[PDB]
Amino acid sequence: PAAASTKVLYYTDRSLTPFLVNIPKRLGDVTLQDFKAAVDRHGSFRYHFKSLDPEFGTVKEEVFQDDAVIPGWEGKIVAWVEE
């Protein structure tokens, strides 16, 4: 009966070292607004997520809408947060 959880790694322009945070939701249910809340960083950002495209393989996909579902990579989320 354990609560849902997704491991989230994200890179910012400032740091060469990525940040690690956990979101209390199942991958597939996690939305951009969930991700933004975990990051909790004000400013004008773009958000790219590591994803598997069926034609091109590993890609970075951008997500715009707050209610939009975040793609995962090997059951986790790997993200780039760019100012």
Swiss-Prot record:
Domain DIX: 3-83
Location within or outside the cell: Cell junction, Focal adhesion; Cytoplasm
Domain of life: Eukaryota
Record family assignment: Belongs to the DIXDC1 family.
Subunit description: Homomers. Interacts with dishevelled and axin1.
Domain-level remarks: The DIX domain mediates self-interaction and interaction with dishevelled and axin1.
Reported function: Functions as a positive effector of the Wnt signaling pathway regulating antero-posterior neural patterning.
Protein name as annotated: Dixin-A
Lineage of producing organism: Eukaryota, Metazoa, Chordata, Craniata, Vertebrata
